Amino acid sequence: REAQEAGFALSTNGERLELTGPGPVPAELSARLEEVTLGSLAASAELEV
């Protein structure tokens, strides 16, 4: 939803997430992307536990 509101397309690759668009994405958008990915992998670690 944030990527759609920002005018960018999300390109999922399995469990890996990245944002594709013309030029660099906004800094807050990149930070939110990194936080979402890190939360997903932390949830995966908790799933393993």
């Binding site: 997430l17 660099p24 990149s30 990194e34 990915t37 890190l38 670690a45 393993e48 536990v49």
Partner: protein
């Protein structure tokens, strides 16, 4: 230090007397590595050692997430930005030389 002639049952009373004593639940002490060379005895509130062990196993398994966080969009884009700046300086030098 209990002093007395032998066969006075000093040990037998002492244990009987100390059994009647009441102390606050002793903390769980455990050897924890502050490094691969240096280990310290740490005291935790009773019953918190099992949770600590579970969390430590979680952080040991966190090597997988450490490896995976180098394969995310933000890390890749920051890497590409760093490479782009380095090749920008490289290309400035290359164009001057050319």
């Amino acid at each position: 230090y209990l002093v007395g002639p032998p066969s006075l049952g000093k040990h037998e009373a002492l244990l009987a007397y100390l059994s009647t004593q009441s102390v606050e639940t002793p903390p769980d002490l455990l050897y924890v590595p502050l490094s691969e060379r240096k280990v310290a005895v740490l005291t935790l509130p009773s019953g918190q050692e099992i949770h600590l062990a579970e969390a430590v196993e979680g952080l040991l398994l966190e090597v997988n997430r450490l490896d995976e966080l180098f394969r995310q969009g933000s890390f890749l884009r920051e890497k590409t930005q760093l490479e782009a700046r380095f090749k920008e300086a490289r290309e400035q030098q290359l164009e001057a030389l050319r």
